[PDB]
Amino acid sequence: SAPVVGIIMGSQSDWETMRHADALLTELEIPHETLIVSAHRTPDRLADYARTAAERGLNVIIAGAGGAAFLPGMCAAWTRLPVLGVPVESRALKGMDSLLSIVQMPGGVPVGTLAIGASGAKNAALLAASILALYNPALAARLETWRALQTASVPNSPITED
Amino acid sequence: SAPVVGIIMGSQSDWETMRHADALLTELEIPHETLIVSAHRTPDRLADYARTAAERGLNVIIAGAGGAAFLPGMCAAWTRLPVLGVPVESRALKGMDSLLSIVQMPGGVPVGTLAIGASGAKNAALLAASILALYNPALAARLETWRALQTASVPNSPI
Amino acid sequence: SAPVVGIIMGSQSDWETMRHADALLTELEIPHETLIVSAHRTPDRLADYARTAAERGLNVIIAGAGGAAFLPGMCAAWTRLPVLGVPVESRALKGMDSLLSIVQMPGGVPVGTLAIGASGAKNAALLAASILALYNPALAARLETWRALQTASVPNSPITED
Amino acid sequence: SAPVVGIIMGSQSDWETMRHADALLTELEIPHETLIVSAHRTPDRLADYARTAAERGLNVIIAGAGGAAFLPGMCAAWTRLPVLGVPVESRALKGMDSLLSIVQMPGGVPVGTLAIGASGAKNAALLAASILALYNPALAARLETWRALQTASVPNSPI
Amino acid sequence: SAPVVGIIMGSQSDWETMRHADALLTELEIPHETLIVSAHRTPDRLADYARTAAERGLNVIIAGAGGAAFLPGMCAAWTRLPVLGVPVESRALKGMDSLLSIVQMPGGVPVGTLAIGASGAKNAALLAASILALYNPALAARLETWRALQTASVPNSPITED
Amino acid sequence: SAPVVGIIMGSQSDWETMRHADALLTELEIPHETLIVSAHRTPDRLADYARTAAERGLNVIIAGAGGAAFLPGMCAAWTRLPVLGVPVESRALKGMDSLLSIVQMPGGVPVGTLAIGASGAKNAALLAASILALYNPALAARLETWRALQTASVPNSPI
Amino acid sequence: SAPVVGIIMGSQSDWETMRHADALLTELEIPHETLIVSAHRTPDRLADYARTAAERGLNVIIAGAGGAAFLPGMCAAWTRLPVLGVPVESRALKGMDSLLSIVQMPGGVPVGTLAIGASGAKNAALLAASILALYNPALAARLETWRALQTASVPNSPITED
Amino acid sequence: SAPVVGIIMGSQSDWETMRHADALLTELEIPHETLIVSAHRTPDRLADYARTAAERGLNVIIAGAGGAAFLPGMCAAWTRLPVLGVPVESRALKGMDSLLSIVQMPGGVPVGTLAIGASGAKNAALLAASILALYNPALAARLETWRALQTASVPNSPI
């Protein structure tokens, strides 16, 4: 029941995107927690969350942020755990600011970045799953099955109907 | 004598750019400190630096950073003081990543952003000067002189 | 009652964005004026406004502009006061033209630039407030309280409900 | 003898680019003046330059500027004369900032914008020439000759 | 009655933007023609139009085009007359492809480029007017009056009402 | 012996890039002509070149151009033959202007666009080869050999 | 009746764009097949499709893909046939990711890339047609007629009505 | 001794960048293999490499690629193992094409993307280390030491 993955985002507005990561982890039966931590508004909350993540049993952290997106990066600065970042699409720059802010981490502090938006949130969950599967045979089996189904479920031709 | 402006940068590599902010402040005789504080590598140092800036007597903070530039923003998250950000030019993206990372702050935690590179470092110092000038008559006069000399020194025709 | 902050914009269309700066200054009880000054259509009005701002008692100027955004920059060319620039989102280029036009000031004439749009307008007001607070204990106290409330008001978890 | 075209730039650093506009005008024997006028550093000089351009007999103004490029635009705000803008290549953003700052003029105050760099400086001169040619038969003939030579001089195969 | 300005565009879809150039020329009483010439679909029509523009009495050509926008440029390759280009906003790239395609002319063949969209179309008309005014006192007077009115018509403050 | 592929470029400056298309065609022994045709400077030459390409026996046209790159597009406007465009890297915008100018052709007049630079020039030749291979068994075999050698030659580990 | 052109796309969502290629090939009477092959979800299906395309009689392959668009490129890595790529417009980046992912092929493995979206799909079909026409007199005649009609069908002036 | 991390790149030219991932893994004493696998030139080699990665004992794959960068993505399409992608800086577009090609993976097949260039190569190794550390106490301790040294080594002021 104890969470092994932590999904964090700066505000409620990010949930529309981050819910996809939540849904996928639940689908693959991966225990996790979902919280709001703002790098700009609650920097001390972030410091404490990231600093204690390992001892609390978390193995992976999935952080979503848009615009001047610091959440994934600053989180990674305080934890040795692998941190995955989801660029949340921004209004004006369509997530380009979100993407560059997260992916361009200088050497020494990594953040595995996923695609902008929903697809990135879902993939962050899947990447976290593939990480946990390395040492969890049962989960590895569920993931393999999930991937196999995805492949087998692709249609052979498009519905070309007018 | 006590510093009223704090100039901070992520690493030695930022100095080539941030040295321009240092030179300007010195030129206008504005007491300041110039330190290295990394948002990515020394987050606690940053937290402590920003938390105590006001208490220490600092009035403005000038922070330079490139790539996923967090220094100015995170610093502003821990202080009520005006934080000015300098986007340091990055190798690949020429500071576009630096600029977006710094300027696109969400409402509630501001960072007055300047141009990418040396021009931005110099302007951060000048902007800090114009801020300090609001309550320092002597400095205000020196800033007026600096701006006047800048304007008067522009040649009338190219060489 | 005398204004210490000047909020200027090129046209009525900018008000939708600049009203956020106005609202925040009023919220923090900072006396200010709100005017329309077009760098392209009323260059002499701009020259006079910027040139006399200091003697008129203004301490900070917040200027909004989009597209070929010259208002903040040209204003700064005529005043020694700190000028803050708000990139107003443009139709086609989503404020990227507005942003580069304002932030890329050459060495010698600064403009503290904020984010594109509403968030930038609000932050320009907050930055102006943090500047005025340096020499206004009462305002400093109001700002500190405002910042503290912002931090304390951040929810701990997202409303994950379907 | 009196100049009919005014070439202006923010600083000496723009000369490397704007010298191409000067060379072209000279080649076509178009009387012109080449000056330094900074929108940021010498705003009053700019205002005066633009306000009086028409009175002085100038027909077209070619203005070069980089980064937050305001020279062409602000000049057009003070004159009814055609203003052509040359985006000077900037260090970091390679003139993309220069280009957007100049070309994106709102309706009501135009600036005919040319390509970033030397090509743009040369074309501003040529565009000014084509404008002047509309009411100067002699120049029109010289422009026709220039364009004809350009076309005829292109090699048929690479070396 | 003979046209002195030629407004051309690649298709009917460009009219929504180019109509602003048409309206402004008419407003300033500048005789002009409005035609459709496609650089991609009617290259020979373009060659002939541009090649004969001068002898037909045209003094300025205003060409609008979007995407791989060649109309202004190719027109300029066939005429000695000044050619003004209007980048028509494109669906996906918002006119950025239109803008670069038109403004980046190599040294030797100029195109005075205006802003993306409606504002650019209107300004192309105004630029054409300022060119014609150089040798047409009456038009020069109308333009001066138009510019003066624009400046005088700018409001002093925004309608800040809720 | 008669050329079946025509390689064209706006000027000598494009040769550094387009020479790669020439080398590849020669390597695969594909008869071709390499000429300079400027869309901006020699529009009539271009019109004539494109109008008569088919009649002359050409099967594919490879056109290189940078900046406001019109060569490939305008050529395609005058011929029914497949036109492949190579975006030449531009000084300031690094070929982004070249790429958008070429690839964003409206429906009705296509241009098969390749990568910016030398890689694109080489691929245009290869793409032209794959087209010609559809009806030339000998060439098809040589292309298969070329592709096979490319694949087999890749090292297993870095030096 | 045997297909000489293969139109492939990663999912049903691409059909809205790829249908234009299908429609044009049918219009010019070019036999073709339309299938769904995902480079990400069905990599082995792609390998087999591309590898056997030539022996199956296919002469040209038109592949559409958006975002991290690998379909055209990977297809070209397995076939000697000419592969044409259609960048499918993406939500956030408007097809810019699609465009760069497809057009920037390294030297050695080409992909003739067309414009982003519908126009690109239609042009991929036309390019494929111009390729097939090189050795099919009847088709060459149909294409010539199609091109001639396009040119002749362009209106001479825009419907300037209010 | 058996490799637990596989570092792959499209060609020798990527080594200048990917060597940083190799150095980091060696520094942390993480058994790994460093190979050249081209998505464009050796697709079957890639398919085989990715299909069998898990069976061979590999835990994480680090793939570097530039331009139309497919290596990381296609590799992830054939393996259930975590795939980390390094955007190699491209000549013209400075790795922007590399970055978008790698990071914009559709839902269902992920690739943890790192920064463009050497910084990204180094971080991919570190990220792979943090993953491996989850089930390797010894390595976890070494990673903690590495991160601690990085933090403690940052100077307090610029030289």
From TrEMBL, chains A, C, E, G:
Q: What is its EC number?
A: 5.4.99.18
Swiss-Prot/TrEMBL catalytic activity: 5-carboxyamino-1-(5-phospho-D-ribosyl)imidazole + H(+) = 5-amino-1-(5-phospho-D-ribosyl)imidazole-4-carboxylate
Give the residue spans that cross the bilayer. none
The top EC class, named as a word, is isomerase
Source domain of life: Bacteria
Name a biological process GO annotation: 'de novo' IMP biosynthetic process
InterPro entries cross-referenced by the UniProt entry: PurE_ClassI, PurE_dom, PurE_prokaryotes
Q: Which UniProt keywords apply?
A: Isomerase, Purine biosynthesis
Protein's pathway: Purine metabolism; IMP biosynthesis via de novo pathway; 5-amino-1-(5-phospho-D-ribosyl)imidazole-4-carboxylate from 5-amino-1-(5-phospho-D-ribosyl)imidazole (N5-CAIR route): step 2/2
Domain PurE: from-to ranges? 3-154
| Residues at which substrate binds | 11, 14, 41
Q: Does the keyword Ribonucleoprotein apply?
A: no
Coiled coil stretches, renumbered: none
Q: Which GO terms describe its molecular function?
A: 5-(carboxyamino)imidazole ribonucleotide mutase activity
User: Any idea what job this protein has?
Assistant: Catalyzes the conversion of N5-carboxyaminoimidazole ribonucleotide (N5-CAIR) to 4-carboxy-5-aminoimidazole ribonucleotide (CAIR).
Similarity comment text for this entry:
Belongs to the AIR carboxylase family. Class I subfamily.
Q: Which PANTHER family match?
A: PHOSPHORIBOSYLAMINOIMIDAZOLE CARBOXYLASE (PTHR23046:SF2), PHOSPHORIBOSYLAMINOIMIDAZOLE CARBOXYLASE CATALYTIC SUBUNIT (PTHR23046)
Q: What name does the UniProt record give this protein? A: N5-carboxyaminoimidazole ribonucleotide mutase
Source organism of the structure: Acetobacter aceti
| Gene from which this protein is expressed | purE
TrEMBL record, chains B, D, F, H:
Give the protein's function.
Catalyzes the conversion of N5-carboxyaminoimidazole ribonucleotide (N5-CAIR) to 4-carboxy-5-aminoimidazole ribonucleotide (CAIR).
Q: Does the keyword tRNA-binding apply?
A: no
| Pfam (any one) | AIRC
Q: Which SUPFAM superfamilies match?
A: N5-CAIR mutase (phosphoribosylaminoimidazole carboxylase, PurE)
Q: Which residues bind substrate?
A: 11, 14, 41
Q: In which pathway does it act?
A: Purine metabolism; IMP biosynthesis via de novo pathway; 5-amino-1-(5-phospho-D-ribosyl)imidazole-4-carboxylate from 5-amino-1-(5-phospho-D-ribosyl)imidazole (N5-CAIR route): step 2/2
The highest taxon in the source lineage is: Bacteria
Tell me what organism the protein belongs to. Acetobacter aceti
By what name is this protein known?
A: N5-carboxyaminoimidazole ribonucleotide mutase
Q: Which keywords are on file for this protein?
A: Isomerase, Purine biosynthesis
The record lists the lineage as: Bacteria, Pseudomonadati, Pseudomonadota, Alphaproteobacteria, Acetobacterales
PANTHER family annotated for this entry?
A: PHOSPHORIBOSYLAMINOIMIDAZOLE CARBOXYLASE, PHOSPHORIBOSYLAMINOIMIDAZOLE CARBOXYLASE CATALYTIC SUBUNIT
Domain PurE, first and last residues per copy: 3-154
Gene coding for it: purE
Entry's Gene Ontology BP terms: 'de novo' IMP biosynthetic process
Instruction: Report the top EC class in one word.
Output: isomerase
Enzyme Commission number(s) from the entry: 5.4.99.18
Q: Which reaction is this enzyme known to catalyze? A: 5-carboxyamino-1-(5-phospho-D-ribosyl)imidazole + H(+) = 5-amino-1-(5-phospho-D-ribosyl)imidazole-4-carboxylate
GO molecular function per UniProt: 5-(carboxyamino)imidazole ribonucleotide mutase activity
Q: Which family does it belong to?
A: Belongs to the AIR carboxylase family. Class I subfamily.
